[PDB]
């Protein structure tokens, strides 16, 4: 009983959108099972429960990057519904600094770590870590961590 669903992955001269799922039941990021180039897109195929997609678009040339949190919600019937539960705009070159921060929450400091190459998609490892919070913790704590660095 499985679902295939698909984020944007495209690092191009002029913009850059990175989408990645995080299972909210693993408490790490999913394995895509298929990473597109010609077309800068992930693909997925999650199994019924909640995933978070965090989400980082970027302007290059007008220093402008916006960063999403949407809930990701799949029932039994294979049936997808979706609600940002989280947005913020701010300059780039703070955002790509944020991966240095020291003190700062990890799964955001891998995150931005993880954006995908020119001209490519970006790609999960085969990992079996956990984070220490839960969904909630892990969203508020990001929230709570961009609202002082902003
Ligand atoms: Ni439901
Ligand atoms: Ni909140």
């Not at 679902?3 to 992955?9: K, T």
């Not at 019924?48 to 916006?66: E, S, T």
């Not at 995150?111 to 079996?128: G, L, Q």
């Amino acid at each position: 009983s499985v679902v295939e669903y698909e984020v944007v992955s495209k690092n191009l001269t002029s913009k850059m959108s990175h989408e990645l799922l995080f299972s909210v039941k693993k408490r790490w990021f999913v394995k895509p099972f298929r990473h597109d180039r010609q077309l800068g897109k992930l693909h997925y195929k999650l199994l019924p429960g909640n995933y978070i997609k965090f989400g980082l678009y970027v302007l290059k040339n007008q220093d402008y990057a916006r960063f999403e949190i949407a809930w990701v919600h799949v029932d039994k019937d294979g049936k997808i519904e979706e609600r940002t539960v989280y947005s913020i705009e701010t300059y780039w070159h703070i955002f790509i600094d944020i991966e240095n921060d020291l003190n700062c929450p990890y799964v955001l400091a891998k995150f931005i770590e993880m954006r995908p190459e020119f001209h490519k998609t970006a790609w999960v490892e085969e990992s079996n870590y956990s984070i220490a919070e839960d969904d909630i913790q892990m969203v508020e704590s990001i929230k709570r961590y961009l609202e002082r660095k902003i």
